[PDB]
């Protein structure tokens, strides 16, 4: 199994180091919005 007489390994291992931290972002979300509608107006008694 390729060890020393004392049992120490004779090969150096590797691990393929994990790939960095991860950055997370947020965004503003807008939805369709409407406006008010108008109704017929009354006739007051006073002048303009």
């Amino acid at each position: 199994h390729n060890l020393s007489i004392d049992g120490q390994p004779l090969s150096l291992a590797i691990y393929a180091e994990p790939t960095d931290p991860k950055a997370l972002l947020t965004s503003m979300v807008q939805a369709s919005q409407g406006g008010s509608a108008v109704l017929p107006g009354t006739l007051s008694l006073y002048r303009f």
Binding site: T42, S44, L45, Y46
Partner: protein, 49 residues
Amino acid sequence: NLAEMEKVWLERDERALEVTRTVSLAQFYQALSSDNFNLTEKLTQFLRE
């Protein structure tokens, strides 16, 4: 609340018919159906006694 009051006043405002009535008390008293009398006669009587 004041704005609501003003709005209801404006929406229910109306120009009123302006009428005049002339009421002569002597004629009104004489024309009474049940309990009538004469204004001048009764006044003169109540003044003399």
